[PDB]
Amino acid sequence: QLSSKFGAISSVLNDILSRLDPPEAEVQIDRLITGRLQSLQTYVTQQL
Amino acid sequence: NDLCFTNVYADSFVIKGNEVSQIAPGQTGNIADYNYKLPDDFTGCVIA
């Protein structure tokens, strides 16, 4: 699930950072962070 | 009206017409690169 875009420009942080302005890049990073954190939470609950 | 300013500052600029759009948080361009830089989390107002 690290390769899923989650409705973003890309799935690699480096390209997002060195492709857009700081505000839109921050928005994209926030979306990616939310998706990955939900993935971790789901995995942890299943493990529990 | 309340809780408005703590360390308020005023700045005076003189630029061209097709240049005010380049003066904003996170902006890029010659004026932002070499003349004046605004912080990304700039909590203020711009008057032109």
Is the CB of residue A21 less than 8 Å from the CB of residue B28?
Answer: yes
Is the CB of residue A31 less than 8 Å from the CB of residue A7?
Answer: yes
Residue with tokens 């240049």: B19
Q: How many A-B residue pairs are in contact by the CB < 8 A criterion?
A: 8
Residue B35: which of B20, B45, B48, B46 has the closest Cα?
B20
B43 phi and psi angles, rounded to 5 deg: -95, 90
CA distances from B43 to A8, A20, A36, B25 (A): 27, 22, 30, 9
| Token pair of B38 as six digits | 């605004």
A24 → chain B, closest CA residue: B26
The experimental technique used to determine this model is: cryo-EM
Task: State the amino acid at position A37 in one-letter form.
Answer: L
**Do A21 and B25 count as a contact with CB atoms less than 8 A apart?**
no
H helix intervals, chain B? 30
CB-CB neighbors (< 8 A) of A21 in chain B: 26-28
- Exposure string of A10-36, with b = 16+ CB inside 10 Å and e = fewer, is eeeeeebeeeeeeeebeebeebbeebe
**Do A23 and B28 count as a contact with CB atoms less than 8 A apart?**
no
How far does B5 lie from chain A, in Å, by closest CA? 25
Task: State the amino acid at position A25 in one-letter form.
Answer: A
CB-CB neighbors (< 8 A) of B26 in chain A: 21-23
Helix (H, G, I), strand (E, B) or coil at A1: coil
Distance in angstroms between the alpha carbons of the first and the last residue of chain A: 20
| Token pair of B44 as six digits | 């203020």
| Neighbouring C-beta atoms of residue B19, cutoff 10 Å | 14
